[PDB]
Design a protein around this ligand. Structure first.
Ligand SMILES: Cn1cc(Cl)c(C(=O)NC2CCCC2)n1
Length: 171
């Protein structure tokens, strides 16, 4: 049985309980905290690519009002984000299970751009999600995992200074 777990969930829970924010920029900004995933139950000798994308958690625009995040009134459908391929992809089951899979080089942008960067809509709430794709074999297979604990609102600057403080404290 293939098992996927969140490394440093205790740190992510500190951010989640304040409402987490991630900066997005024209050229794209790396995430803190970084999504790190513990994986076991892979075939050490099978071939896999690790994919990261971001699900719009709701169809609303959010706004920071008298120090609290509140959803707009007017839902729009949120098309799914583009996928980021972990740069170690493709790789042997063994490679992925020997240390936490770390998405330290994904960059979050608010502008359609060349390559690498994932465009998110500013002031939308997002849930990180991975896909483990078994490649090369005859039977292709995908297993998907969500990380509720890692939810955030995409922002051009931090609104909650409690978030600013946590980011600096643990970076
Ligand atoms: C051009 N390129 C470089 C890498 Cl790496 C990949 C890749 O892993 N593609 C697919 C494997 C199944 C999911 C995405 N494609």
């Amino acid at each position: 049985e293939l098992r996927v777990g969140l490394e440093e969930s205790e740190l992510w829970l500190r951010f989640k309980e304040l409402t987490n924010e991630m900066i997005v920029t024209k050229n794209g900004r790396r995430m803190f905290p970084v999504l790190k995933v513990n994986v076991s139950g892979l075939d050490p000798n099978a071939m896999y690519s690790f994919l990261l994308d971001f699900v719009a958690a709701d169809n609303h625009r959010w706004k920071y009002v008298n120090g609290e995040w509140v959803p707009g009134g007017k839902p729009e459908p949120q098309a799914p984000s583009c996928v980021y391929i972990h740069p170690d992809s493709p790789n042997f089951g063994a490679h992925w299970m020997k240390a936490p899979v770390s998405f330290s080089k994904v960059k979050l942008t608010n502008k359609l751009n060349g390559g690498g960067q994932i465009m998110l809509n500013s002031l939308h709430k997002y849930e990180p999600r991975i896909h483990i794709v078994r490649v090369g074999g005859p039977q292709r297979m995908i297993t998907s995992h969500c990380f509720p604990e890692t939810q955030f609102i995409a922002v051009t600057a931090y609104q909650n200074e409690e978030i600013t403080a946590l980011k600096i404290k643990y970076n």
